Symmetry: C3
Subunit: 449 residues, 3 copies
């Protein structure tokens, strides 16, 4: 079938105390409204009409989906009024699903359910029964049939007793929506245009409204302040964790895990406490990730062991690598099979070959390191003259003594050995020993301050 | 009006298994009893009478408030007896509020409520209804009026059914308190002096006792062991977190945040998981604090980005700074606008000028660094001859090569450049290149062990 | 009395999505089944019969207890059938307790209770009443007496209403067990051998079955997937935490603490958030452990202060030491009294004497350091020529300048002083100043790229 989605995101989010549009505040690493658009496109929406009021600049900057149609609502005179603005783009032959930009957790499964329930020529409405229905539009039925919605401000003490409430999500046909929308007036408590009136209009036209319910309450919870955003973030993380656990991923504490992106994985992956996964992360089989690690946009091969407090960004680790604790891999770091990176080591745009080790207090940037190479503690590749960055190349079987600086550009041939404390400014030959050392001397009977 | 507070802190805290007075064990970074004194002074108490038994030495050492009057209770013969000791200092014309030193969460709002309820010449009593009232003094009323309190040991099976219990907090007039206190005897189950008897004495004198209730149960919960202290700590942290969230501060996980001091803040501040705030911390607008950071007594300007696992103490960061991950700023560290501090870098009593960068494996202590300065990786300021510490000064536009030691005291002029691996013992001129390098040589066909 | 235990561990654990036997997946640092064996031996079991199906190789590899008797169950035809295999080794004069290898939390106290309840010649059965008894064997009683168990598949709608269910744990005499086991047939819903039938057989023999209940539900919860394992891990950690709190150990957040081994401790020990304890750890009096520390198999003396994010393995710290933040102690690290280790410092097979300090960016391996020694920042002991490792010895009162490398083997005598930036290849005399420095020179008017 055909269907388009309209997302209302023109409301003011003052209880957030922010200089950023409310629907842009993130949850799980992404804008609240991006979550809604994702569900919209995942549902098959043909067009996605974003109705906004202000901060349109900040909005277009952050939102760049293709099926995105921007609709301005200069004045917020109500949800019905906001829909009136988008109406012009509705297709008589297409279904129109309405959503809120501040209700991020709504699921596609529930939206698919609502979809299939919409009566022909009728309306699909999503409702939930709440313990305390205060503030919500009340659902009135006659002989068991939905005949309308009474906003909290307008309901009578008696109607206020109804616990079935309107969540705000509904689907109808473009043409229908258009005829009803045109007949809206604002004679009411709030003195605005209620999109909720269309339920009545449709009913007295003979049409029928069907009400389906969500799988969970959080599915239709809206965000008006940062406490509510916080709450939903935990709900989301708890769901993510459950899925992973049931999928074979062991989490040492599901309450202390955060997934802010996408995780692909093999079998027997084990993740300890307080680990954060961001962007796109791929883990091979039997990968072990110690406590406190932050992994972002990286590939980690089979049998890798990431020790506690290790930060990895845009890195690529081949099989059987061991890194950490306290290691920092920056964009471009690559570790071939069996490579080892110890504590207080930083890598950026550098490849460490098979079986090579960089054990301690080392900085490797803009470097190409061969296999079975040993980088002594304190080694640093000085890759920047203050204007340009230069490359350092270290061949296979090289042994770099502790506290060596390699002033780029420089190449060290296979099997070379670099004396501890050497400042390397010139290429080193294969099988040669490079050194720039002052012989050690002594001064007898020396007294300090 | 006039009012004084009496804090009972002379009881034994044996279930703590500690060599430190029970009321000194901290909650949220401060002694349990300091919490009570804070509420007392915040309520306007004129005098605060601390009734203690032992560890008076450790107590005076830790408690140094001005309105503090120490009252010794050599023997713990009961709460009534403890009040008898403080009685001599009560003012006939002042109200006397009684509190417990091991009930830290009592709120000022609830204490203010009790204050305004106290009948003229009567007593203000705080009561709570509990599911299991075992162990607590039972509140007896007649025709709906509080006529006394029956301690658990003395109540009858029937009175033990009463669920309204005495929390221990009450307020009365100095003179009244004095006449009643003098009439206390210890004929009872426990064989001690119950301050709770004054309720009866006042009633048969014709006076009236009013009972107000707390806002929350935790408000009047007492601490007898470390599990209970733990519980209250989480309650306290949860309240703190809520306030911040509602005030515009985004916390990625309110359950993984700890505030042990005071936090001032601007708008759009974002705090990730497991961050600890201690002492007095001020955050400008849009400050981002990554996971695992510990921030103590520091000032952080607008737009600063603190990366994961960064420890900051008594530091001052100007606007737009970026520090971490794995950075350690010690007392005296100062970063001017746009300064950058990378991983595995430590600063102590050192100022890093505008746009200056200290990227990796570096230690800067007792240093003054100008603007647009670049401190190569591995650089260390050797600020201590073993007896005294000395200052290092680096002018603007200086470029310090990797692995350079600056033996203090030394000054590097503007625009100078220091060769990688240099040991700087003498001042460097402006626009000069300093170096102390051995030319690199090679030994052909070298074989390692 | 005499008693042997049989542990069924031959079932398939497919919902784990693992290549490792289900009962080998760990909880609190140890294999699920090791937990059961521990309780078995702690209960006094004489023999422990492990009934397994596959992965026997991986099982024997990981399990090496002495009283362990391996019984193969090539085909899993039911629990009764599995017991039939172990039957041959039962002693007519001994009690036989049956347990599950995937029910790790069962307690010895509850097992001791079941023990003492077993009627003479009867059966001790453990039962729990569940809200939703679906899937569990149903307990049928007549006139209040247990007369059998009806498996869920076989119960009638009416029997399915019974909420008292069989947990699977039972104890009986060897001889009895043997006669009943021999009379089992598999005419039933599942078409297998139910060990649960023996309850009926015993009843019609005139014997009596007694049902005792566990202290907590988690005690008899089984693990079929990683979500359930996760759940139990938290239950276990929560219990551990409670015990410690009640024993005098202060935990800043009992929900953020993990004990995966054994902890011995003194008084007033304080542990902050996110600390992990592994293997055997001993803490003296008043030890303070900051947030994020990982302590494994170490000894920590009185008054030690471990700062945030410090990793300690197989270390030994004397009294009053201070280490961290960001410190890494590896196997063999030893700190004598009052020693200090700062940030970004790593130690391995090295002893730091009384009052000695290694403040920053330092690596000490295979070293012996005397008392009152000061290791300047950037110091590194180059303990490996690429084939062998060598020892570095530093006498008392030595002062090592920043960025010094000590090429092992080398000895520095008492009171010596090593100039900053020195490469030490030869022994240094007592009270001598060692140096290998190029005098600093300057090049006027130097311009960078
Ligand atoms: C000192 C340094 C700046 C010189 O760079 P360079 O210009 O490429 O080296 P050059 O071969 O051109 O010679 C430089 C000058 O120093 C002098 N020089 C070289 N080696 C010397 C030594 N051992 N002793 C004294 N003077 C020496 C030369 O005479 C030469 O100038 P000249 O034209 O008068 O002969 C450079 O080697 C260095 O240490 N750079 C820093 C790299 C770094 O740490 N980067 C970190 C990136 S994050
Ligand atoms: C080596 C060191 C101790 C000398 O300090 P100093 O006394 O201030 O330096 P001085 O100029 O007084 O001269 C010291 C002696 O060494 C000798 N010397 C200096 N430079 C030398 C060189 N390149 N080669 C050989 N000998 C040298 C001098 O002859 C002099 O003694 P003299 O009186 O016999 O001539 C010092 O430079 C050093 O490295 N200090 C450590 C700083 C540090 O790392 N602090 C960390 C704080 S946490
Ligand atoms: C350079 C190094 C490899 C030499 O080791 P060594 O063989 O034990 O030292 P030796 O005394 O045997 O002499 C080595 C050679 O270098 C030459 N040499 C020594 N000092 C020199 C100097 N200052 N300048 C030039 N050449 C020098 C010698 O002539 C000698 O060879 P020769 O037989 O031709 O005379 C060594 O000192 C070193 O730096 N090792 C690395 C240690 C390390 O960092 N380990 C980390 C473990 S994780
Ligand atoms: C009249 C109406 O529709 N009532 C419904 C609306 O209440 P109500 O009108 O009170 O809801 P809100 O004011 O929060 O607005 C709903 C959503 O519409 C957006 N918005 C609102 C006004 C506007 O002019 N433009 C705009 O884009 C808001 O940004 C928000 O995303 O949602 C409730 C659920 O939350 C339902 O139970 C109510 O029946
Ligand atoms: C007789 C009396 O007052 N009973 C009240 C008291 O019980 P109860 O007397 O049982 O309470 P506690 O023994 O815990 O003592 C209360 C507080 O008084 C202090 N203290 C106690 C005795 C002493 O000689 N000196 C001293 O300073 C303790 O340190 C504690 O801070 O508190 C309960 C609430 O917790 C009330 O429900 C009881 O009605
Ligand atoms: C017939 C029987 O005994 N029923 C009991 C069994 O159910 P049920 O037979 O359904 O239980 P499971 O299939 O999970 O097996 C129980 C335990 O026995 C092991 N196993 C099973 C079959 C086999 O051939 N070999 C083997 O070693 C499993 O690995 C598991 O550790 O446990 C339930 C509690 O969990 C009880 O309420 C049921 O009354
Ligand atoms: Co060096
Ligand atoms: Co160095």
């Amino acid at each position: 079938n055909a269907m388009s989605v309209v997302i209302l995101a023109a409301g003011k989010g003052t209880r957030m105390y922010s200089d950023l549009p409310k629907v842009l505040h993130t949850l799980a690493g992404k804008a609240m409204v991006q979550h809604v658009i994702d569900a919209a496109n995942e549902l098959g929406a043909a067009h996605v009409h974003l109705v906004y009021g202000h901060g349109g600049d900040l909005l277009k900057q952050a939102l760049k989906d293709d099926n995105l149609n921007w609709v301005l609502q200069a004045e917020q005179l109500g949800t019905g009024h906001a829909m009136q603005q988008a109406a012009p783009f509705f297709a008589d032959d297409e279904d129109i699903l309405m959503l809120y930009g501040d209700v991020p957790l709504i699921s596609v499964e529930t939206l698919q359910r609502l979809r299939d329930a919409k009566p022909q020529g009728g309306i699909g409405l999503l409702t939930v029964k709440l313990d305390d229905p205060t503030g919500y539009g009340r659902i009135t039925r006659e002989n068991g049939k939905v005949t309308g919605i009474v906003e909290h401000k307008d309901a009578t003490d008696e109607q206020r007793q109804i616990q079935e409430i309107n969540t705000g999500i509904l689907i109808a046909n473009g043409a229908d929506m258009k005829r009803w929308l045109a007949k809206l007036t604002n004679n009411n408590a709030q003195g605005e245009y209620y999109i909720t009136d269309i339920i009545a209009l449709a009913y007295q036209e003979g049409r029928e409204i069907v009400a389906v319910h969500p799988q969970r309450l959080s599915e239709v919870e809206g965000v008006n302040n940062r406490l509510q955003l916080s709450r939903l973030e935990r709900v989301y993380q708890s769901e993510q964790a459950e899925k992973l656990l049931l999928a074979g991923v062991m989490l040492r504490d599901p309450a202390r895990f955060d997934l802010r992106g996408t995780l692909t994985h093999g079998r027997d992956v084990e993740i300890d406490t307080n680990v954060i996964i961001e962007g796109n992360v791929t883990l091979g089989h039997r990968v072990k990730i110690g406590t406190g690690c932050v992994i972002k946009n990286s590939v980690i091969g089979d049998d890798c062991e990431i020790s506690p407090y290790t930060v990895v960004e845009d890195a690529n680790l081949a099989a059987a690598c061991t890194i950490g604790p306290f290691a920092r891999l920056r964009p471009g770091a690559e570790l071939l099979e069996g490579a080892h990176v110890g504590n207080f080591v930083e890598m950026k745009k550098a490849r460490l070959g098979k079986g090579s080790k960089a054990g301690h207090l080392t900085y490797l940037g803009d470097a190409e390191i061969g296999d079975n190479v040993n980088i002594g503690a304190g080694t640093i590749t000085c890759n920047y003259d203050g204007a340009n960055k230069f490359k350092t190349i270290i061949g296979d079987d090289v042994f770099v003594g502790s506290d060596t600086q390699l002033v780029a550009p420089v190449t060290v041939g296979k099997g070379a050995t670099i004396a501890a404390g050497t400042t390397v400014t010139r290429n080193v030959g294969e099988n040669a020993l490079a050194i720039s050392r002052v012989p050690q001397t002594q001064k007898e009977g020396w007294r300090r301050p």
